[PDB]
Design a protein around this ligand. Sequence first.
Ligand SMILES: O=C(O)[C@H]1/C(=C/CO)O[C@@H]2CC(=O)N21
Ligand SMILES: O=C(O)[C@H]1/C(=C/CO)O[C@@H]2CC(=O)N21
Length: 423
Amino acid sequence: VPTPAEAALAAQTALAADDSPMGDAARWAMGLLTSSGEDVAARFIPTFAAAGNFAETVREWRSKGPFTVRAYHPVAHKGWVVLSAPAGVRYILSLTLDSSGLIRILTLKPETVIPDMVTWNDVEETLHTPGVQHSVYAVRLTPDGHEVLHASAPERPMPTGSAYKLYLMRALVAEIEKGTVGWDEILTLTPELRSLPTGDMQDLPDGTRVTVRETAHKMIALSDNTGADLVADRLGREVVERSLAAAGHHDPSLMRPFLTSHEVFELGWGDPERRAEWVRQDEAGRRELLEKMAGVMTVRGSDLGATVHQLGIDWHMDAFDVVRVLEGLLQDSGRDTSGTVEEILTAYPGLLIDEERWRRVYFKAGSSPGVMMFCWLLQDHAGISYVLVLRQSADEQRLIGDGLFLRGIGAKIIEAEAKLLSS
Ligand SMILES: O=C(O)[C@H]1/C(=C/CO)O[C@@H]2CC(=O)N21
Ligand SMILES: O=C(O)[C@H]1/C(=C/CO)O[C@@H]2CC(=O)N21
């Protein structure tokens, strides 16, 4: 158990030594904060829209220092640096990178505090926020069903954002198995198929040719919305929908029509009249509205904010549905002797994982205004699997925040697995 001084020193050294895209970006961003006084444009994605306000943003950040590194948490294309400022005030620097190491998101925010968890009640009492509906569901998978380790509101259907991509993955695998689509088949990016971040594929030029395998990899590992939309277009909505009952969903009608990310963005934050039409329409009327809406996006990232999940403009499922889709994916992966499914599912575990404990970890996050979820399947080297599903929804995005809180609650549960999961 490293003492505070030990932990900070280790973090400082690790940041200095990290020879990776995240290490490069984190050191550069820390340089911005600690330094005496076009280099910016070269470090960020080409379409970085805050470039004008950025000089002021950095001035304001710098005014909060001086800063000392206390913790460093690189996780693939995501990274967090915990900083202490004067008088014991703490902040977190959050980085999200694109596929070549350019910065997409860079924030410096008040520290997200998550205590070490001893009991499930610690989890519940930490997580609870007035005005936020939450759910925690943890199970051990066994031959003859699931052993419930903890449950709060698992039966409640809730919006889950990009968790829907798990169903899309199962639908894709089902079609690969049938031979109607192939891993090396080429998908082509068109202006109409481009969606918003999360993801990187939207940044590719019109006409870019990508394999089904690479597109599915990004769909899961980067939560790539454009990747997901390319897959959903190739399979077709009917195929995606007809798959839902088999892949584990209890009431497919909640995700009919099964929306694309493009559709959620455009409907959710585009013209209000069209959105009011959705609300008053039945399934037929909604399908008709979506067909009419097909085309190039008008909605931009800056338009998002107001919650729309309460109108059905999201993907609703219960915690049991999440466990079923994950267990289904575990089965699909084992059946795939090529290891293609496994490589996609294990690429990004969402945390730094103890690989001596866990043979495989599947992970998926979901987020939309007023929506946050994280889920993991963890299987040890003996073959015992656990599934953890964390969900939050609210009428106001500010009650949820950037998702580090819920992720960090998951991190603490997994850290305390011997007490909370495998006791
Ligand atoms: O993949 C991740 O870890 C991302 C994510 C993606 C949702 O599409 O949602 C949570 C919030 C965040 O930064 N996480
Ligand atoms: O390891 C942890 O406890 C948490 C954390 C907390 C931020 O101080 O940062 C990383 C991301 C995450 O969930 N981990």
